[PDB]
Point group: D2
Amino acid sequence: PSIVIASAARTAVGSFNGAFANTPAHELGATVISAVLERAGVAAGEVNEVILGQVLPAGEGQNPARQAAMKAGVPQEATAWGMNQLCGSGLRAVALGMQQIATGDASIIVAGGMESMSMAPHCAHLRGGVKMGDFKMIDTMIKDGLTDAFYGYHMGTTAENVAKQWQLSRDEQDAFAVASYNKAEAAQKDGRFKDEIVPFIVKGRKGDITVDADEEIRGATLDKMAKLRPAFDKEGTVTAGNASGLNDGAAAALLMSEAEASRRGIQPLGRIVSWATVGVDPKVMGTGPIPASRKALERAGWKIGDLDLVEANEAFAAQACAVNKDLGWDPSIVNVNGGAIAIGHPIGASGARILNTLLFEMKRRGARKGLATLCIGGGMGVAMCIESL
Amino acid sequence: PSIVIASAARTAVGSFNGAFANTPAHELGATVISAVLERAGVAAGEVNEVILGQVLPAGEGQNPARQAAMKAGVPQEATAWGMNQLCGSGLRAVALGMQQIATGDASIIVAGGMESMSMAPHCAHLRGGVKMGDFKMIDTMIKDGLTDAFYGYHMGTTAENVAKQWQLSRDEQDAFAVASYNKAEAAQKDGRFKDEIVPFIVKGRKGDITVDADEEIRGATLDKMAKLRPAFDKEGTVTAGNASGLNDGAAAALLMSEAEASRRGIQPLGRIVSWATVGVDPKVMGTGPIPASRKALERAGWKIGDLDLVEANEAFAAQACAVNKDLGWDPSIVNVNGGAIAIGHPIGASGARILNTLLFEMKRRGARKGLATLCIGGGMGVAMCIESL
Amino acid sequence: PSIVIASAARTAVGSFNGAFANTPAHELGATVISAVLERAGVAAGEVNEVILGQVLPAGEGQNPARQAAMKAGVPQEATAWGMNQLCGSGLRAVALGMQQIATGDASIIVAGGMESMSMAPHCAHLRGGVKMGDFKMIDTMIKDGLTDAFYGYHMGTTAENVAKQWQLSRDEQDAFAVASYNKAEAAQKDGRFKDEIVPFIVKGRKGDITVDADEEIRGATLDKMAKLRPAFDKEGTVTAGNASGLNDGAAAALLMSEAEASRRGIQPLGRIVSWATVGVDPKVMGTGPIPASRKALERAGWKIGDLDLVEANEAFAAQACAVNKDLGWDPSIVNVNGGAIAIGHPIGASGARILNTLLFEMKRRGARKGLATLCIGGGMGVAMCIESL
Amino acid sequence: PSIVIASAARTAVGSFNGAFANTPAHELGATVISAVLERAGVAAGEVNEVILGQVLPAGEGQNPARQAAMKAGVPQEATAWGMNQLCGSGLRAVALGMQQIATGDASIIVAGGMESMSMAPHCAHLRGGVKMGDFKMIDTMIKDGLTDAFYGYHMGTTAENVAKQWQLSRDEQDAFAVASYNKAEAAQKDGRFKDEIVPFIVKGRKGDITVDADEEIRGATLDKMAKLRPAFDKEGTVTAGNASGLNDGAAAALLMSEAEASRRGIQPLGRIVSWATVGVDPKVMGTGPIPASRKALERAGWKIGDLDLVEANEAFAAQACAVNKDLGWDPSIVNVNGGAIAIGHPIGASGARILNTLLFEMKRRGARKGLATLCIGGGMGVAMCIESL
Ligand SMILES: CC(C)(COP(=O)(O)OP(=O)(O)OC[C@H]1O[C@@H](n2cnc3c(N)ncnc32)[C@H](O)[C@@H]1OP(=O)(O)O)[C@@H](O)C(=O)NCCC(=O)NCCS
Ligand SMILES: CC(C)(COP(=O)(O)OP(=O)(O)OC[C@H]1O[C@@H](n2cnc3c(N)ncnc32)[C@H](O)[C@@H]1OP(=O)(O)O)[C@@H](O)C(=O)NCCC(=O)NCCS
Ligand SMILES: CC(C)(COP(=O)(O)OP(=O)(O)OC[C@H]1O[C@@H](n2cnc3c(N)ncnc32)[C@H](O)[C@@H]1OP(=O)(O)O)[C@@H](O)C(=O)NCCC(=O)NCCS
Ligand SMILES: CC(C)(COP(=O)(O)OP(=O)(O)OC[C@H]1O[C@@H](n2cnc3c(N)ncnc32)[C@H](O)[C@@H]1OP(=O)(O)O)[C@@H](O)C(=O)NCCC(=O)NCCS
Ligand SMILES: [Cl-]
Ligand SMILES: [Cl-]
Ligand SMILES: [Cl-]
Ligand SMILES: [Cl-]
Ligand SMILES: [Cl-]
Ligand SMILES: [Cl-]
Ligand SMILES: [N+]
Ligand SMILES: [N+]
Ligand SMILES: [N+]
Ligand SMILES: [N+]
């Protein structure tokens, strides 16, 4: 059997404490589920399962994936579950949903990711009780999302390790970040994000607000970016400018077999050809996409030169430069409409966000072979190959 | 391809704020991964992926599944991710790992679940700030694990709905709970839990303690059970005695193809024949196993009368009576060594705990066809069919 | 013995979460201590004791009164302590300092109050530990400052009881509030607050800001006041417009004997003639100033007609109207420069704030006999009689 | 005018998280107020004001002194306020009440202190909001009670400075502590504490408990004292044995003029002859009683040799040895029934606790001249001279 992506959608990527500062992740995920259903011409009553990746679900309630599926209109007879592979959760959920149809355990799968880093709470274990002295309230976003569990420092410190081993100057990282900002603003002004973005209605107290544009896409200049101070190492190279930010958003895609889409008269966005996930040293988790993309290309029977478009998530300017320089693919086909440095980085949703960007750009310019990949905290990477029609 | 379970292991189920009151969940899972590897004669360097279900990972760090795999000795090249389908997470992870080998994306999978409900913290969203007035610190165990997101009451109130619609008296629920307590002591005194339980060393400051026995198994009398007060509805029927408790523990299983085990000279515990997951109304989530077991039996081509052993998770005495009475299978083969009312109910790990109990129960008495099933919060159920040899 | 007030000073009354949103109370009090010393021509080495009233000292450290005296320059040989009689703390500290010199145990006393309601934290008793369930983080400002400990409702509900017993319509309360708002702008625009206000420099990270004007004086119109919703009772009459707000500030006064000021050639602002404090029913604590002012006038040998100026703190429009009609003094001499409804109500500092306003306004228009009074939560009141020169 | 102490009472000193682990301070104070009235034969309607020292009132509600007076039976017409001079609050309140009657502003005063260090909560300022990162929950007991606001270290570090400047060996501090432990047990077993202790009924959920004995008095030997670890400096001399602990309790005294007691036929416990308070360097606040006692004795016209009994609060073994060696008074009359090292140290109540012990021990052995004194954090001391009647 062969599994195709019939439709795809994503919300606008909101800034930290921005438009989605008080919107739970399951409400964002409910909109993308309803969107991919209307775009594919498939009713909610036909969905078998909903697989949504999410990294920071504390305080949101019992299984936010079920909450997003029910709110979207999926009937109670269907099932839904959440998964956590950190930054690759959004893309892995699509591969997992593809495996559901491959084994014959499902027919129609809605897979993607959702993350609301603004809604992440502060926690502390208090069952034993603090009889004396002070104690710390731990930020779940920093602890459970952005801190390496083995070495104790932020993910930005891992990018510093990649910067030293690959010898990437501060100017090369800033130049890469300004290039990502300019491609993202050019794509937004030309309306190349309108096809993938579904508008989200933020029910506020003083009237409702329609969010349909990524609010992190600003105008970056090389001089103001070079004046920023390093955010992690006191004498490092990774700053707030050349590193992705904290963001909210959701993205998903509707999966079915190629024979199913042909029977329904659906023109799919692409066929999932292969996928792969490999682990690396946690010290340099940014190098994850390098062996993961090679394994996916090997499973598909493709060479690196056969790729027409590439979406590599830009967690940091340092890790992105190293991935492009090791794999050696043409950078003019990698992130043609910008990356996470300018658009945003919702952890659980980034895997499906770049897949949304990849799918519509392949259809818009007639590409035949595409690949999406991300780096994962703890030393992992994930990649997937898509073929047109 | 055909997938077999080469080995299985589980830790002792600890009581709430008991032996594992300060032990993180990933430390429990690390012991089960090492156990299933040593029991099967498979080195850690051969593991491709580790899939562990977990419901309450807040405050534990980046991807506790990766932390458990690394501490067990699995090399960095392998991958690991967590999943959350509430109480069915432990069993669903085994089906997902089974799908990894079926699609050809892996060869050896360690799948299971881990949960430390004692380590669940209290949280509160504090980024926006509380300008005036009091606010609530939310227990993540109650909110994200035991409270229905749609109707707002505890999972025990759902058992009250099942008790009312099925008209299950308080005496019938207490008699079912006392029967489960007595079966657990008979199995424990006869040492029928020694094969599945792997001893866990709690490294303390005042010497190390060896935990190798389920700490929830006590002695229950019918009169002491009748004196208990209802724990959820002020005039209900579900009490602390006839309901499962809050517990810590972990369980896992080593997966490989049937041809792989034959090449390695391994005699597997059983072959995974089929599996299924179906959704129901959240009001009566305890009825989850009823359509899930029929769909799993239908996928395997089995009738209910063909089953030799059955492990049905006893979330509540009311919901367990309803599942046995609708499916109508012989209760003398269901939970032969007791259930969660006496052993414990670690949410993310119960799915693999009853699978461990089922597998070793099939090997000791030569059963041929078995089935394990659980109910899931939010209105879902999961089931799996296992065949000996 | 005869005690005189040689000098007095106060900071500008800041709004809740306003200019002093992050300024500790002892830093505000330290500037007022330096001011009353410099204005009276008395060195810091001559201060015997510092008495500062404060209601919300949680989280500020050991004895904030000692911190304010030390930072102001008072030597270590002198002593300092805090007291708490709620809203009357600022005025009671002046009477207590007067008693220190009267009994001969001191010669020079700096007495007043300081309060930073913006810096009040949220607290919770956690030594025993919360084994299960949610718990409340208690706002110390609401609990320890604004909630009646006997009946459990806010101080605004007490104003509702006083309004009902005196039959004060909502329009009569709104008209009284607009009268104080209009008087406050007349005094501020004419610079009648510059003599009492000492400028405070808010040392920030992005430059320093000089605060020298009450930021709560905004100006109320009769129509906009009538459109506001009741803030306490769902069908009441006390709203945010006709009720005082939450504020930060500090105020103090330098005390010495009449012979000492004559010996140093110092001209005091006024002589303390008498003082009194009486308790009332907590349900109607707003009626506190009625018996307290009569008891003070009785001790001084004065009639109500002998008073030239009166400063009665306007905690609420309802409680203030009842005091004016019961005592029956000329309203044209009561709060001639506005009240707490327009200026603000820092609880621990209000007692010295109205004393500061009274002293300088008596000098501005040549008044001879004045009286200041406040109402106290829990059912108390305090009053003091002052004679110029 | 001459002021006498007509009656006095105190509760048993409870251990940290002990018998009074859940008893608010105002409930402890309410029993002491009812006791001093019942012991003197004075109705509650004759009390003019209640002055109670308290250091940790966070979370207890509006003016805990008013709460204690109301529950004790004092009518609403009387007033009540709290004061805070740290460890000298209990004794300073007695001196303040003496000044109320001396100036003629009151006739009957109930003065003392109350403290419940077990009920002190953890707090944190959260109005501005924590937008990113971890934050600390501050222990109000350590921050607002036991940490010097100027140098940042615990009060125990201050005792190390006094021990070093006076060169007090570790053996001399332990020998002084065991001497107080042995003197305290002789008083308790001989029933010399029964007259001052008033029984307190702890109404609990599992039955009521009668507390009528200081639970901190344990058996101390020289060997076990030498085996303890230093509690502050990693290589210091102050340990948990030779330092006072955290405790709960309350104490008060009934004040009136000497002519008033003669008119009511009351036999007073003693006459307040003089009092004094002096400040010292915060690094060595334990030396506070040295200049404070000299200032009190000179005001009373007494020589050190004229004293018959002395109660010097033993905050630490180091600070007590320095005070006894500097003043040079006979140690056989100093703390004849033990000190705070064995009985306990409730901060707000210790000033009245040693006053209670001093008054009854002077009446028990016919002493003529006595003195009580304490050291205060931040560098202060307080002393009072008492003459028996
Ligand atoms: C990098 C990071 C620490 C930034 O934290 P931050 O400093 O609080 O973010 P800020 O928005 O406040 O940036 C601070 C400063 O940089 C400036 N700045 C930010 N982006 C800029 C840009 N693109 N161009 C120019 N200036 C910029 C801001 O204006 C601000 O200056 P100011 O405070 O004086 O106004 C945070 O975004 C982060 O942790 N990123 C990592 C995400 C991650 O790990 N993802 C997973 C990877 S696998
Ligand atoms: C039991 C529960 C309801 C909370 O009640 P609880 O008070 O914490 O239960 P506890 O054991 O701590 O104390 C309960 C009382 O019942 C008694 N009790 C418990 N089990 C008993 C038994 N088997 N026989 C006799 N008495 C028993 C306890 O000793 C205690 O008596 P006590 O008041 O004298 O100490 C909690 O375990 C729960 O929420 N369970 C449901 C979670 C769930 O739904 N899991 C599945 C998810 S689908
Ligand atoms: C603090 C208090 C102002 C709370 O009100 P709040 O709504 O939470 O805070 P705000 O004042 O900012 O909101 C007031 C609203 O009325 C408006 N308002 C306030 N004063 C106004 C005035 N004088 N004229 C016209 N409109 C006014 C405000 O702009 C605001 O409108 P908004 O909804 O658009 O923001 C007040 O109700 C209170 O509780 N005071 C207690 C003080 C006290 O008890 N002291 C002890 C006395 S013994
Ligand atoms: C000294 C202090 C740090 C103790 O902290 P602590 O760790 O809770 O001390 P604990 O009593 O709980 O435990 C001390 C140990 O020594 C033992 N011990 C204590 N006192 C002892 C004694 N007098 N004789 C023999 N053994 C003793 C205890 O049993 C305990 O045994 P453990 O090792 O099994 O725990 C604390 O009480 C303190 O800060 N005191 C100073 C308060 C203060 O400032 N007072 C002056 C105000 S100006
Ligand atoms: Cl800018
Ligand atoms: Cl001058
Ligand atoms: Cl003097
Ligand atoms: Cl000035
Ligand atoms: Cl009088
Ligand atoms: Cl008694
Ligand atoms: N950025
Ligand atoms: N139970
Ligand atoms: N106001
Ligand atoms: N002690």
